[PDB]
Amino acid sequence: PKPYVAINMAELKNEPKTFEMFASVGPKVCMVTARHPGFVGFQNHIQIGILPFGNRYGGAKMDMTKESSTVRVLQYTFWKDWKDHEEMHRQNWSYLFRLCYSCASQMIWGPWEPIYEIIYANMPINTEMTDFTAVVGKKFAEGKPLDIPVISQPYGKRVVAFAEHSVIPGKEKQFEDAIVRTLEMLKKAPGFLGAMVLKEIGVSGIGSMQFGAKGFHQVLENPGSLEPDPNNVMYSVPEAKNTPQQYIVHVEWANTDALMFGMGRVLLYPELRQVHDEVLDTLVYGPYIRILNPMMEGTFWREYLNE
Amino acid sequence: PKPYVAINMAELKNEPKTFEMFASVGPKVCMVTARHPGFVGFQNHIQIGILPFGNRYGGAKMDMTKESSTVRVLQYTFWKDWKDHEEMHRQNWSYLFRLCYSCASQMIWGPWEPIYEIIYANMPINTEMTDFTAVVGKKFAEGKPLDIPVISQPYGKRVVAFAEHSVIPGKEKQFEDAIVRTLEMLKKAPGFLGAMVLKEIGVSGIGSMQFGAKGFHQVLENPGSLEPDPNNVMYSVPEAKNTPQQYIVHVEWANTDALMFGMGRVLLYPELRQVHDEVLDTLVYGPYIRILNPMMEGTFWREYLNE
Amino acid sequence: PKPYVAINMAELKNEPKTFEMFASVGPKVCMVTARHPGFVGFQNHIQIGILPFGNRYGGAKMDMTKESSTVRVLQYTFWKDWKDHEEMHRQNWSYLFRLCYSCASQMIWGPWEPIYEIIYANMPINTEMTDFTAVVGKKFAEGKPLDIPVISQPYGKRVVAFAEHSVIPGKEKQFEDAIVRTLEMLKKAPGFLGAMVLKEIGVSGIGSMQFGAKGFHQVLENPGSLEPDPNNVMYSVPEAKNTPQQYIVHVEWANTDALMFGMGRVLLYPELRQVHDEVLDTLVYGPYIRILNPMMEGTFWREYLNE
Amino acid sequence: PKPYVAINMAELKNEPKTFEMFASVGPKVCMVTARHPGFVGFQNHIQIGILPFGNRYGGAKMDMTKESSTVRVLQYTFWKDWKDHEEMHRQNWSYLFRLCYSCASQMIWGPWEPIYEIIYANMPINTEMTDFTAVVGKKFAEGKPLDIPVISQPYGKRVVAFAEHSVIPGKEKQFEDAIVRTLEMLKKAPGFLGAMVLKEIGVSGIGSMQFGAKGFHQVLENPGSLEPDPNNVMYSVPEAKNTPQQYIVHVEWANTDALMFGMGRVLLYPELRQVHDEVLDTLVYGPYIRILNPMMEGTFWREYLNE
Ligand SMILES: [Fe+3]
Ligand SMILES: [Fe+3]
Ligand SMILES: [Fe+3]
Ligand SMILES: [Fe+3]
């Protein structure tokens, strides 16, 4: 079934110490999150750059890692029920807060953790290049060659287009209908590895370290080993849902060239351009497209997705 | 009276070429904007850093300019009526678009131009250190020594705390009452040069280069000398207003130490801390505090503010 | 169906500034061209070298990019009707001219844009290495394993042999019959990714910036933002068709070794040599073979080709 | 059928001289071992690092070869009956001892040669990337597409997780049942190339150069060309079997990322975590996981395994 998605976002100093902490602390956070039976996996990204759209963002390029002073992370966690995410945070708060807070020395902005419903998904299971022979054998044995997926390699060996959209109030249905039509046509592009549309349902105060006054002071005053009061979050997840409605159009690609020209198909192929124009007419903001590297992941979220 | 504020936000490459364009293109944009009689001035900022709040943002510091790969600009223009801004853009679109678009080669994100109303202001006229003798003489001659302001030096010779807040729906009145009480007490801090509270009323699509499909393609395909259809903006300013409600708490300071410990007064002075706690209990996001340098400005906006 | 092909040819300075402009301006031109419903895609090449034919061109090699002072581009655009190309140029002249003229600072020769009919095509859809599993599954499910193509990777991950021929008047049918027989046999060579034969039908004056006196002066005098009179082109496309008849034999290969020995099969394999000798007997000029890299492309042109 | 496994373990100086001897002496030892008809192949490893388990072993990393002062080798030989190994050593003692003893100048610890039975195996035949087309063709021709293996590349082109476990006496059956259930679920992880469970049955005294007093002196006093008395081993293989019972869980992976996150599936995927917890409850020691490179091997041992 379709899981819910929590995306923890932060910006940190682009230096070796940061990536060393990703390597030691990141796995610990994921192991704690996996204590909850509603957890069905994760996909953690670093932003490597920005799609320049010609020279609309002429100061950007798809890989800015060599020059950037910061690194943005976008950590997707997947949940049977979005309420499972909220319960997990509170049930394991002592570990989670102390782990997450240890990243403070590297932090410039965040954490900020919106929650999403998936309204469309065409996403395959991940496979390594070593797996495809067995995958093909099995699908033919089952008499379902149509279910043989493209090879979507895990652990940093593909790239993601993270396309931000916000929609004019009242035009949500037009956006959703048109973007689904767009993505159903987009899958013809070479190197297309899947797409999904995420629709914001709210924001996790606790995941964003956004408490009332009491918790705020506890965060600011923390030596690193004392939990803020987890009951001091002052808003529920839906209370923080944004209007204009926010969406993420998440599209995966074999490589950054396939991404650039593939995403570009909605501009370069007249038939698809006409369909995608219906998306563009609904927007308050976007499309703004971040280029992401899915480095650390629990690929079994796609097994749950596709059952 | 209190003007409306349009804040054009962008992120650009941190390199000499960017600042060379600020120097050449910036004044031209301001001269075009001054064609409209509703224009009452401007205050243009570059972000120099982020308030670390101890080590809550431990990767940040108040001056990050030597290390940062990007520069964020926040260009305030002040307007008698917010519709004056929208009218100005359209009446002068040929000049404005071509000027603004010439920055494309340096752009990483933006432009994004929310519009605000000022709901609280305690902001003095700017004066240079050469002026105070005459200011004092004049106020005494008028029998109004209480009207003698602090010395708030223009053109990069003071600093700004730009504090982002978003508020739980239904808690706006508590936020507004508490932040005003806070700022009324904060003005006792040494080096305090003024404060105002901005409340978002919407977003300028045309100022954000956010069009329908037609205008989007014209922007992407532009050689630099052809205007997108200015009538192709698909939403009014209020249609893009965010919920949760967004605010900016803008506080000016003599120097960054006065900023750090002065803003810190809401955490360090128990009586004020109790008042400011009422602000904190209402928040979805924040406070996140950017440190800004007000470099290029039309100081006469404060003459309008203060009659 | 078979589209018509326009090939925009130019020679530019081989320096980073040139490739920076390819990256920013190139996509803009393609997006403008895609405004026309007759546009079915594109395949844009840079020449990387010349086939030396042993040491017949002993000063040449298949990759001369490290030493060359110039770069030659060959930009294929594909059209339902060649008249669509002419209409597109005129309907979007303000954008197209200003964009294309921006390349002037780098130009040494060109642009020159002949138009071609495709008289033979054996060209597959492009696929990335990630795609083949799904392609195979799909074709077997449809009961068409014979329609499973070789893997022709897009975006610079294969090479093109661009073979120029001009034919003795009266020998066009002998050439055409012989070259088709040759290419039908050539497809047995390892790494063969497809071939097509292009026959010149004329030249686009407007695409070649070739006007009468009025337009010529407007081009020479242009500050960059003023269109030459598009009605000042003095000849139709067919009026410029060359005699001796010109052809391009376009053959794609997995890599330059496969190209060298694969194209060499018409010299090294006695059965094929006898067939290709019938081609050679018809020539005024050629074969002269440029080695091309298809870097930027709209791969859906092959979808139109293959229906 | 399942062969027995002798694993000769040693630690040597990490310097070119050591690897030069691997290259010269290694093949000779294997050729001597192949004199015995019970020999069914071999798989020789060097340890490249240690799995850090987050920062549980924070001083370790998966590839420590650039910094390490030593190299650990783990040489697997496979046998129809474990007595074949003991017989092979004695029948060829003159050659084997002199060859093995020539490594003395590089040795820091070892040799130590436990013997194991395989109690669980899901291990494919090795194939190179050149082979898979023929493998697939053959399996389909035989009507057994389910028998098509993943591509497990020989000769250092994959990696091994070597997971040490010792089990509380009386809890062996719980361990064995739980680890098999774990590995049956683990095979879903991307890049999984196979797993087997080895259960220690004893230690080869002669393979470990562990003699009585007489043989010990002959070893210490050896000029290199005189055999210790092979009859002076004072214990049989089963007499040296350890209690607590020792096991090796041997899992093969496409690459070290697939290893890290794949092995991590038993911690990160709640359903699998619950199963693997039953393993953890039985342990005296472990899991301690060595990262191995299977460099030199006789791949036909898997042909015996799989008939
Ligand atoms: Fe979370
Ligand atoms: Fe504006
Ligand atoms: Fe053209
Ligand atoms: Fe042995």
From Swiss-Prot, chains A, B, C, D:
Q: What is the effect of changing residue 30 to A/S?
A: No enzyme activity. Still binds iron
What general EC class does the enzyme of this chain belong to? oxidoreductase
- Protein task: Catalyzes the simultaneous oxidation and reduction of elemental sulfur in the presence of oxygen, with sulfite and hydrogen sulfide as products.
List modified residues, type Cysteine persulfide.
30
Where is it chiefly localized?
Answer: cytoplasm
What gene is this protein a product of? sor
Question: What upregulates this protein?
Answer: Aerobically induced.
Pfam families attached here? SOR
Q: Tell me which GO cellular component terms the UniProt record holds.
A: cytoplasm
Q: Write out the residues that bind Fe cation.
A: 85, 89, 113
Q: What is this protein called?
A: Sulfur oxygenase/reductase
Keyword Iron on this protein? yes
What compartments host this protein?
Answer: Cytoplasm
Q: Which InterPro entries match?
A: Dimeric_a/b-barrel, S_Oase_red
Report the EC code(s) recorded for this entry. Answer: 1.13.11.55
* One annotated GO molecular function: metal ion binding
Q: Which organism is it from?
A: Acidianus ambivalens (Desulfurolobus ambivalens)
Activity regulation: the record says: Inhibited by zinc.
